[PDB]
């Protein structure tokens, strides 16, 4: 039910994946730097 809910809110109006706040104690900057440091990824794909 919530999967269809989220899919409909994303299709009907585009929402950038930065303004989505899972909970009030969630920080986008910190979470993303923690995740990249934890799981390294290739930068050539992002740049080339």
């Amino acid at each position: 039910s919530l999967d269809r809910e989220a899919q409909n809110m994303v299709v009907n109006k585009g929402i950038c994946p930065e303004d989505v706040i899972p909970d009030s104690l969630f920080s986008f900057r910190h979470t993303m730097v923690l995740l990249r440091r934890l799981f390294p990824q290739d930068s050539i794909s992002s740049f080339y």
């Binding site: 303004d19 706040i21 909970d23 009030s24 104690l25 986008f28 900057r29």
Partner: protein, 48 residues
């Protein structure tokens, strides 16, 4: 949740010309009498 949203908005906020114009209006003219009162209060140092 309101405080978290306020933090998120104020974090990635870049001041535009129109916002600075509005804030300059607010601080310079529409709040003039109150600031006059506050500036008067300082400078009334009193002795015993």
């Amino acid at each position: 949740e309101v405080l978290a949203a306020a933090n998120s908005f104020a974090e990635n906020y870049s001041a535009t010309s129109q916002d600075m114009d509005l804030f300059q209006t607010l601080t310079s003219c529409t709040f003039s009498k109150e600031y006059a009162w506050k500036d008067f209060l300082n400078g009334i140092h009193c002795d015993v």
